[PDB]
Design a protein around this ligand. Structure first.
Ligand SMILES: [K+]
Ligand SMILES: [K+]
Ligand SMILES: [K+]
Ligand SMILES: [K+]
Ligand SMILES: [Mg+2]
Ligand SMILES: [Mg+2]
Ligand SMILES: [Mg+2]
Ligand SMILES: [Mg+2]
Ligand SMILES: [Mg+2]
Ligand SMILES: [Mg+2]
Ligand SMILES: [Mg+2]
Ligand SMILES: [Mg+2]
Ligand SMILES: [Mg+2]
Ligand SMILES: [Mg+2]
Lengths: 190, 128, 53, 232, 160, 467, 75, 50
RNA sequence: AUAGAUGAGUUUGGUGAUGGCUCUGAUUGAACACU
RNA sequence: ACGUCGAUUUAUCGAGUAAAAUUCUGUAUACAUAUUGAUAAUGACAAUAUGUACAUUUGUCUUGACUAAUUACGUGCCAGCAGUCGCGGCAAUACGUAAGAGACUAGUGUUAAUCAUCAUAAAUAGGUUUAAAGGGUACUCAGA
């Protein structure tokens, strides 16, 4: 429908297998933007390294990283590279993560906590974009050791994929893991 | 440090950080009055260039410090009672104080229209 | 009242559903903590004396 | 949301006052919150006063505004319920994410969930404003005749209002027993009695009577409310 | 003493980190009480005291150990069967709280708060999957088993 | 029955050892190990009161997906109940007789629960399995035999009868093998239990620990039907099969199998023995003179009352339901405690273990019983003083719901020939590929055709013999 | 915030079915399998309308609704 | 820690979760890979356990 | 009292760390300047 | 007021519902009356209630990034700005004017100080191979 005449989403249209009008309905955001430099025999070569998160808003999130000499070509690479790396992120009652998670990425330790409903997204700016794009509504996060713009995103995205699965923990111990909130109200209250 | 090492008092206070305006930070004062001892010019540091109007002031406490004269043009000279406030000229070493322009003897910029409160200038009083 | 209630809970029977769904631990391992003196200690000391000699 | 019709307000008033039915039964009958049924009666009582005192009602403003809002006429034409009469408050203790490990074959009931959140918490079966509906539904599961279950509901609710009215009666009667009204030439002095020893274990107690000695004036503090907090 | 519980906590971590099917522990009353508690929670598979060599795997629980007298007490050893599910150990972390340098004790008012994800004292709230073990007058119980019995006591370790 | 109703129903009585049974719970597995090797894991009241609550409890959980029952020692799995103790109680007045009657209540109550269990139930027959041990196995959909397995029901030798579920499992068995195993009290060892049909699979004794570790991994979905769950386990049990022996041949097959169908088809013991005498007599076309003569010696050394009574329930057992079977067996076994044969046989062959001579049955021989006499009638008349057994549930069925995981028997080969036109060798391959290569299908199917099939239209068609 | 609970569910069930399975509840097949069979699965036991998100974000300015000057404008 | 992380023993778990929901909310999930139902009831065996 | 735990700018050709400084929040028995 | 002003593409975009104007209210407050602080009696001074009446100012900081908000002109490493990084060397969104915009408001900024930021003296709760930091050694009293 004349939306994508640049040919950028064509290849992505095959991998993901969905209309171009749907690719534009995703929540994309450029979190990090570094200005790296490489010394060569012909002088410095300065590149832009950009990380972009793509999220559906209801439990899907993807992280993409790319770089180029032009800041515009780098954002398009990560955008397409982030929409094809989307993964289903489990979330308790479609509003928060399961329990607490702690991930370390080369000196950057991130700690995510699940909070009750109505708590809100009392997190940093980079964690706010990811949670807001994945569908998370109540969470608390703290950076313990370092606050690298890049490793903080890699750790956060890695923590959402390392949530403790309550059903696997149950079969491992041979005991139920009854969620009290679901029995109290006779059903999940999203 | 083990628990026994903390009983004997191993957690001592961190070393103090020098204040921006020691003459004021010491006695918990927001400002101090002083008599100018010399009104000259200071040269900025490596990157900057120009001439900063500075005044060697002797505070009421007794210490002699180097204040900065903000604004364009001043009317203070030897033996002038001026008020001193905290601050610093980032490109001038030793200049760690400022002078209020609406002070006792120092007069505010007369042709100032922007941020008059910072330079002690009354309203032009045109339509008044 | 607060005392009897607390003392009653600290000496209450285990839940039935938790007694029928727990693997068996042999009593020879979970209750035989006492270590009595070797009944054959005297006979062994006499036999060890001959071997050492 | 819809608003009770001008006539519907009369149906509720004529039911609680004339027929003397309990507010709980009227609430469950028309699916109107007990707090709204009590407010409609208060507002209607004021109308009777105005009409009794020959005061001009704002009929032109009432008719014109009622045509801009959706309405729900009660009685015969009951297309939908007015609102939800079984709304329970989300207690902060019950908002926590708890996965309690229990045996594989346990019958975890709402009672067990309340104790997991806290030892003093009650299940949702006791936080309802009309807890008689549960008992009414338990009779239908046994296939008890319908109108017979309605009879028990009325007696249950009607009996519950008596207990409430009896409690507040003894309370108000005990509050006036502590007041000694001594009439004088000008005023009537009201001497209230109280146990002066109920000042906690260290003198600090919220319900203590007196002006606390060791406090300065907070009038210079930010956000110091100086407005009447309660118009009683 | 409590030093045995710390050595036991770290050993079970190293054993699960190495993906070992069996593991040995010094035979002591203190160690056995914590082992039984872990078993009652489903974290380990078996408990059996034997010699320096593990019993037959096929008949582990059927293995009838010999009486523990003073002639072989020095060689006895507790053998616990570790548990692994879904490419992950069931006993990943066994962070201790009470160390020889300080024995941390908790009250019933604090255990009630910690059992619902809220810090109290020198402890931190429990999250999904985490488990806390307290040594009380009624044996080494779980923090939630000690809340129903209305008792507090020494905090031993925290299992994730 | 709820948890409390079960806890107060199976309360430990005095004399109950605490570690009679050893229960274990793995990821998806729940095991039940009979820990009494000193007595060959002989079932008793103390051991039954511990299994019933667990089974009822595991039935309420969606976590337990595979139940396993096994023995402790390396020799026996469950070597019959404690019938010796019942003999003493029977000689302590009427009240002392009702103690044994209540024991059979616990046993039948448990064996009925196993038969109508709503979860996959496996049984490792790694060792001798007799009496009570047969009640925990035959009703399961999976019965694994091994090199050490030894199946037999030596209850007609003690004056008793096939106790539990044998009146439901043996009658609806291919051919007259049921009545043979019951009356004669034959002894099947090893793979012979797998060929006869008692066992469903056949593994080695050493590959059982590896099978359990695998069964614990299987995690079925909550929406899978009971059929799928059994299919997943069946395929897993067949992965550990190391192959049946190469030289061991089908014991009850060919001539012997045919002879059983020609001498155990009547409803009277007199006719049965009469037929065997013909086979025993040299010159008979059967060619089983050795087996026939040996069988007669075994039939003339058992209580004649049990024979008449046993054979009576084999013909009626084919018309009862599994639930109605246990109830009748309760009243049936209750009248045996009062009889003289049981009290005599048990005291003579178990308590005295061969001392004082052989058991003296009240009727010395079958010929003594005149033809017109019917001693099998009294044992099938429920009396009022014995309340009817109250089973733990209300489930029942006339035919086994899932009993097709064993080798294909005559019933499977027959229908397969009517729905199609398979040939001699083409029909064998049909079962092999349909069975996914189960060990022993080629030999079992071939045996069935050799007995109950002919060369109707030359090589292409194959039809049955009985027209 | 509040939660609506019908007395019909309270009378029949006591909340045990919500813990069946492994604690979270009895799992159901995926969406790409249900309609594949012409027959739908049995209804899940729960209160009516018990999976709708609650809009806590819109209550940011709720305290202002309590003032006397705002309440007059909202009436 | 030089070696790469092999998640081959979880392909079914990972692949099944990716097919439970569709990226485009409000639509039914597309058909899963043809192997998802083939190994549905054949989980891997426990490895790396001495 | 069960909602209460948050970051940002700045060292390098560049990356990742270590580590200070400053900013963002609240406040004063305050002072000064413009009002 | 089918007027005025500001820009500028000379016809577009704003000032602008803003103003004027019209219709109402009577808030602080003023005045008046009554009650009240107190009763045996004593009121220095004021509060409260009711009635009538009145529509009265803007100011300040910011505008390169941190940090919400723009152009034009002048100056030309000069004059000056600056909490941190920094800006100014003849076509400066950073200095000085003008206008616009962002924001607080009878207050607004600045200076000084305290808490938090800072797990930045870490009891809860740190660290010491190569980055601040393992004592030259281990026998050993006290002490853990
Ligand atoms: K740092
Ligand atoms: K500098
Ligand atoms: K065995
Ligand atoms: K050294
Ligand atoms: Mg301006
Ligand atoms: Mg370098
Ligand atoms: Mg007034
Ligand atoms: Mg900006
Ligand atoms: Mg300025
Ligand atoms: Mg720099
Ligand atoms: Mg400027
Ligand atoms: Mg004010
Ligand atoms: Mg030295
Ligand atoms: Mg040195």
């Amino acid at each position: 429908d004349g939306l994508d005449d640049k040919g950028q989403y064509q290849e992505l249209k095959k991998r993901t297998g969905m209309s171009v009008r749907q690719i534009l309905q995703l929540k994309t955001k450029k979190l990090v933007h570094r200005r790296v430099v490489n010394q060569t025999r012909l002088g410095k070569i300065a590149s832009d390294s950009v990380m972009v998160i793509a999220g559906n808003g209801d439990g899907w999130l993807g992280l993409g990283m790319a770089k180029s000499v032009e800041a515009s070509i780098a954002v398009e690479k990560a955008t397409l590279l982030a929409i094809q790396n989307m993964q289903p992120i489990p979330r308790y009652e479609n509003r928060t993560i399961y329990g607490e998670v702690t991930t370390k990425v080369s000196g950057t330790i991130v700690r995510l906590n699940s909070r009750p409903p109505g708590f809100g997204l009392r997190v940093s700016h980079r964690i706010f974009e990811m949670c807001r794009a994945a569908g998370i509504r109540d969470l608390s996060a703290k950076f313990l050791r370092s606050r690298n713009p890049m490793n903080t995103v890699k750790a956060t995205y890695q923590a959402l994929l390392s949530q403790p699965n309550p059903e696997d923990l149950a079969i491992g111990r041979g005991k139920k893991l009854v969620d009290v909130r679901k029995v109290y109200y006779g059903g999940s209250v999203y | 440090a083990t628990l026994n090492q903390v009983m004997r008092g191993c957690r001592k206070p961190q070393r103090a950080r020098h204040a921006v305006s020691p003459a004021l930070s010491s006695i918990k004062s927001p400002a101090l009055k002083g008599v100018c001892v010399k009104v000259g010019i200071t040269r900025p540091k490596k990157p900057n260039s120009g001439e900063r109007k500075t005044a060697r002031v002797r505070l009421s406490t007794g210490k002699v410090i180097t204040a900065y004269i903000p604004g364009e043009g001043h009317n203070i000279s030897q033996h002038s009672v001026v008020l001193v406030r905290g601050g610093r000229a980032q490109d001038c070493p030793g200049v760690r104080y400022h002078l209020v322009r609406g002070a006792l003897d120092l007069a505010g910029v007369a042709t100032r229209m922007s941020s008059r409160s910072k330079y002690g200038t009354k309203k032009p009083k045109k339509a008044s | 009242a607060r005392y009897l209630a607390n003392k009653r809970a600290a000496q209450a029977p285990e839940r039935l559903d938790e007694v029928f769904t727990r693997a068996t631990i042999r009593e020879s391992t979970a209750k035989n903590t006492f270590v009595p003196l070797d009944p054959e200690a005297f006979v062994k000391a006499e036999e060890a004396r001959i071997k050492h000699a | 949301q819809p608003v009770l019709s001008e006539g519907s307000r009369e149906i509720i008033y004529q039911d609680v006052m004339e027929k003397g039915l309990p507010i709980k039964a009227v609430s469950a009958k028309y699916n109107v919150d007990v707090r709204r049924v009590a407010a409609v009666i208060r507002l209607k009582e004021i109308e009777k006063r105005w009409i009794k005192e020959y005061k001009p009602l704002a009929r032109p403003y009432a008719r014109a505004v009622m045509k801009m809002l959706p309405q729900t006429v009660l009685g015969g034409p009951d297309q939908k319920p007015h609102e939800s009469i079984n709304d329970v408050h989300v207690h902060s203790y019950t908002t926590q994410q708890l996965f309690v490990p229990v045996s594989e074959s346990r019958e975890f009931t709402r009672e067990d969930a309340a104790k997991a959140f806290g030892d003093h918490i009650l299940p949702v079966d006791k936080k309802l404003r009309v807890p008689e509906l549960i008992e009414f539904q338990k009779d239908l599961l046994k296939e008890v005749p319908l109108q017979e279950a309605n009879r028990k509901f009325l007696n249950a609710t009607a009996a519950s209002e008596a207990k409430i009215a009896e409690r507040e009666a003894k309370r108000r009667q005990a509050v006036e027993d502590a007041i000694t009204r001594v009439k004088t030439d000008r005023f009537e002095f009201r001497f209230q009695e109280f146990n002066a020893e109920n000042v906690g274990h260290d003198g600090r107690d919220r319900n203590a009577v007196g002006w606390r000695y060791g406090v300065p004036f907070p009038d210079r503090k930010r956000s110091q409310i100086k407005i009447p907090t309660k118009v009683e | 003493g409590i030093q045995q519980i710390t050595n036991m906590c770290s050993h079970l971590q190293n054993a699960s980190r190495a993906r070992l099917g069996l593991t040995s522990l010094p035979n002591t009353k203190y160690n056995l009480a914590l082992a039984l508690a872990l078993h009652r929670a489903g974290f380990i598979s078996s408990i059996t005291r034997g010699g320096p060599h593990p019993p037959t795997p096929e008949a582990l629980m059927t293995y009838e150990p010999e009486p523990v007298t003073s002639a072989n007490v020095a060689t006895r050893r507790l053998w616990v069967g570790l548990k692994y599910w879904n490419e992950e150990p069931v006993l990943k972390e066994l962070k201790p709280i009470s160390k020889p340098s300080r024995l941390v004790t908790a009250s019933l008012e604090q255990l009630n708060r910690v059992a619902r994800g809220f810090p109290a004292g020198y402890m931190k709230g429990l999250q999904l999957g985490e488990c806390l073990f307290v040594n009380t007058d009624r044996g080494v119980l779980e923090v939630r088993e000690a809340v129903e019995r209305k008792v507090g006591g020494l905090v031993l370790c925290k299992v994730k | 029955i709820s948890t409390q109703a079960a806890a107060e129903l199976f309360k430990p009585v005095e004399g109950d050892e605490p570690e009679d049974v050893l229960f274990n719970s793995l990821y998806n597995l729940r095991s039940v190990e009979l820990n009494r090797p000193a007595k060959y894991n002989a079932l008793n009241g103390s051991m039954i009161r511990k299994i019933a609550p667990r089974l009822l409890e595991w039935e309420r959980s969606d976590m337990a997906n595979v139940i396993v029952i096994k023995g402790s020692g390396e020799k026996a799995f469950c070597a019959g109940g404690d019938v010796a103790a019942l003999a003493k109680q029977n000689a302590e007045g009427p009240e002392g007789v009702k103690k044994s009657v209540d024991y059979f209540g616990l046993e039948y109550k448990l064996n009925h629960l196993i038969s109508t269990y709503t979860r996959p139930y496996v049984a490792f027959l790694d060792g001798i399995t007799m009496g009570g041990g047969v009640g925990l196995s035959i009703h399961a959909p999976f019965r694994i035999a091994t090199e050490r397995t030894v199946f037999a029901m030596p209850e007609t030798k003690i004056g008793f009868f096939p106790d539990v579920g044998a009146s439901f499992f043996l009658p609806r068995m291919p051919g007259q093998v049921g009545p043979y195993l019951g009356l004669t009290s034959a002894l099947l060892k090893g793979v012979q239990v797998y060929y006869a049909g008692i066992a469903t699979h056949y593994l080695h004794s050493s590959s059982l620990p590896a099978l359990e570790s695998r069964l614990a991994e299987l995690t079925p979905r909550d929406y899978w039907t009971i059929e799928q769950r059994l299919s997943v386990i069946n395929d897993t049990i067949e992965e550990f099969s190391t192959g049946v022996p190469y030289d061991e041949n089908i014991e009850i097959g060919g001539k012997i199998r045919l002879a059983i169908d020609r001498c155990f088809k009547y409803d009277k013991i007199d006719e049965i023995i009469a037929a065997l005498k013909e086979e025993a007599a040299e010159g008979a076309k059967g060619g089983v003179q050795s087996w026939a003569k040996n069988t007669l010696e075994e039939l003339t050394q058992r209580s004649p009352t049990s024979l008449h009574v046993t054979l009576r329930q084999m013909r009626l057992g084919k018309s009862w339901g599994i639930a109605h079977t246990f109830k009748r067996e309760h009243q049936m076994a209750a009248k045996f405690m009062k009889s003289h044969d049981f009290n005599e046989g048990v005291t003579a062959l178990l308590i005295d273990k061969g001392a004082n001579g052989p058991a003296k049955w009240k009727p010395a021989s079958l010929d003594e019983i005149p033809p017109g006499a019917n001693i099998s009638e009294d044992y099938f008349r429920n009396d009022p003083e014995v309340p009817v057994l109250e089973l733990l549930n209300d489930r029942s069925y006339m035919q086994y719901p899932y009993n097709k995981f064993g080798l294909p028997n005559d019933y499977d080969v027959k229908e397969a020939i009517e729905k199609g036109n398979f040939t001699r060798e083409k029909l064998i391959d049909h079962f092999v590929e349909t069975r996914r290569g189960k060990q022993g299908v080629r030999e079992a199917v071939s045996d069935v055709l050799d007995r109950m099939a002919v060369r109707s239209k030359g090589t292409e068609h194959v039809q049955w013999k009985k027209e | 915030a509040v939660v609506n609970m019908d007395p019909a569910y309270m009378a029949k069930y006591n909340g045990s079915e919500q813990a069946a399975g492994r604690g979270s509840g009895l799992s159901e097949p995926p969406a790409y399998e249900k309609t594949a069979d012409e027959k739908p699965a049995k209804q899940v036991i729960a209160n009516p309308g018990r999976k709708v998100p609650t809009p806590y974000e819109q209550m940011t300015f709720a305290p202002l609704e309590r003032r006397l000057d705002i309440a007059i404008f909202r009436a | 820690g030089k070696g790469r992380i092999f998640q081959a023993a979880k392909v079914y778990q990972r692949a099944s979760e990716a097919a439970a929901t569709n990226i485009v909310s409000g639509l039914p999930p597309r058909n899963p890979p043809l192997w998802l139902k083939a190994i549905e009831s054949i989980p891997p065996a426990e490895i790396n356990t001495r």
